[PDB]
Amino acid sequence: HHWGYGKHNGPEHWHKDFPIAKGERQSPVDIDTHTAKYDPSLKPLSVSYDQATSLRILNNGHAFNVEFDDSQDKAVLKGGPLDGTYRLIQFHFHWGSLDGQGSEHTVDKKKYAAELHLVHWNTKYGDFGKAVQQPDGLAVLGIFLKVGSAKPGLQKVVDVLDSIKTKGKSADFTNFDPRGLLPESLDYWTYPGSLTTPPLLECVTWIVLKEPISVSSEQVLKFRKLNFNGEGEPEELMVDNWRPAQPLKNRQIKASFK
Ligand SMILES: [N]S(=O)(=O)[N][C]C1234B567B89%10B%11%12%13B85%14B%1158B%12%11%15B%139%12B%1061B%12%112C5%153B%14874
Numbered sequence: 667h668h669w670g671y672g673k674h675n676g677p678e679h680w681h682k683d684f685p686i687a688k689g690e691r692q693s694p695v696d697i698d699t700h701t702a703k704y705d706p707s708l709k710p711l712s713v714s715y716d717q718a719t720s721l722r723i724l725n726n727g728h729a730f731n732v733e734f735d736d737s738q739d740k741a742v743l744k745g746g747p748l749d750g751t752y753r754l755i756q757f758h759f760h761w762g763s764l765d766g767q768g769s770e771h772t773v774d775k776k777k778y779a780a781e782l783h784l785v786h787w788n789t790k791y792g793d794f795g796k797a798v799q800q801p802d803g804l805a806v807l808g809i810f811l812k813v814g815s816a817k818p819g820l821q822k823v824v825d826v827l828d829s830i831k832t833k834g835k836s837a838d839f840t841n842f843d844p845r846g847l848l849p850e851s852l853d854y855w856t857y858p859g860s861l862t863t864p865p866l867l868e869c870v871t872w873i874v875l876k877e878p879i880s881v882s883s884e885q886v887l888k889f890r891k892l893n894f895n896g897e898g899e900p901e902e903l904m905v906d907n908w909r910p911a912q913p914l915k916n917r918q919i920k921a922s923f924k
């Protein structure tokens with residue numbers, strides 16, 4: 667509730683309040699690249715973000731969410747493994763205290779410095795709340811971050827973080843274009859899984875891009891200045907807000923590329 671990323675409330679404890687934490691399709695997972703199989707049945711992936719309308723950025727005490735107006739069919743994900751149309755509702759990141767950790771998914775056990783999640787809901791279910799009662803309710807586009815060159819399209823996010831340092835703070839964040847966070851290639855891996863935060867609901871088709879984006883050390887250092895705590899409370903830096911890899915169980919990871 668109550669849940670977080672610490673010793674007494676972190677991922678090892680979540681199962682007590684959220685028993686699905688030990689479920690059959692939990693996320694993240696390690697992506698074993700040798701075992702993932704090219705799937706010719708996957709259709710072309712379509713990321714259509716031209717009309718995306720951002721509203722606000724919020725520090726929710728675990729991460730920050732950039733929120734979108736999803737009241738009309740605008741920013742949508744379709745194709746690939748997906749049947750129908752999934753509407754963008756928000757994005758957020760997971761990141762580490764050091765550049766050698768921070769991602770939730772891993773690639774041949776490699777951890778990236780951070781991971782971006784663009785969260786979408788299946789428009790056949792009418793609203794996000796109904797979508798998370800369905801096994802195909804959500805699609806999350808996951809993008810790895812490595813530290814090197816700056817990502818210019820990220821800088822507007824970085825520069826607003828000073829205004830949402832603590833839990834419960836929000837700021838207007840209109841006219842942000844999420845196209846500036848996408849790598850060149852849409853090559854991906856896909857598998858059925860879950861939300862990686864409580865309530866850990868098993869509603870997600872994961873689409874994890876193979877090509878990371880590069881961000882600068884200065885950009886990620888600013889993520890690490892955020893706080894888990896609220897205003898006036900003792901400072902706990904918002905770092906290491908990632909769940910580690912979970913058992914693959916009865917799943918196969920499919921690749922979009924040969
Ligand atoms: N890492 S994740 O995208 O699986 N889960 C993060 C969340 B935050 B809150 B709503 B929002 B949407 B749902 B709950 B929490 B869960 C998705 B966003």
Ligand SMILES: [Zn+2]
Nearest residue numbers: 759760783862
């Ligand atoms: Zn996430």
